[PDB]
Design a protein around this motif. Structure first.
Motif: not given
Ligand code: NA
Ligand SMILES: [Cl-]
Ligand code: NA
Length: 129
Positions: A65-70, A72
């Motif tokens: 999780n990187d908080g920016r890969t909608p 995923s």
């Molecule tokens: Na994400």
């Protein structure tokens, strides 16, 4: 941290990668060489907006999780930033999950194009293991 070739080979062996799912140590060292140049802090952004992280360039679309890969997944159950640590433990544990997934090491495009079918033992030649 930028690993030496033999330093990384020893760390990988200690974490149980030599012959994991039948892939000898040389394969993992070769893959790390071409994915990240042995640099734990390597990041690379993909066209789809996902990002690859760390020494084995593990992708945020499925594995972390990187908080920016909608939309995923986080199949390794870790923040992607854990993959950039100088301790390769999280990267290694996550790679074991990836390589069991059905495609083996073909999941790593640089392994498939640069290591597969080559003399991978050369990558560990001369190391005290
Ligand atoms: Na994400
Ligand atoms: Cl396989
Ligand atoms: Na080998």
């Amino acid at each position: 941290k930028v690993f030496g070739r033999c330093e990384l080979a020893a760390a990988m062996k200690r974490h149980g990668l030599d012959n994991y799912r039948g892939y000898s140590l040389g394969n993992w060292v070769c893959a790390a060489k071409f994915e990240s140049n042995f640099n734990t802090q390597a990041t690379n952004r993909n066209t789809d907006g996902s990002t690859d992280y760390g020494i084995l360039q593990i992708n945020s679309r499925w594995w972390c999780n990187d908080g920016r890969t909608p939309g995923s997944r986080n199949l390794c159950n870790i923040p992607c930033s854990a993959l950039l640590s100088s301790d390769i433990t999280a990267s290694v544990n996550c790679a074991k999950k990836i390589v069991s997934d059905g495609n083996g090491m073909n999941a790593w495009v640089a392994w498939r194009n640069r290591c597969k079918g080559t003399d991978v033992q050369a990558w560990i030649r001369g190391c005290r293991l």
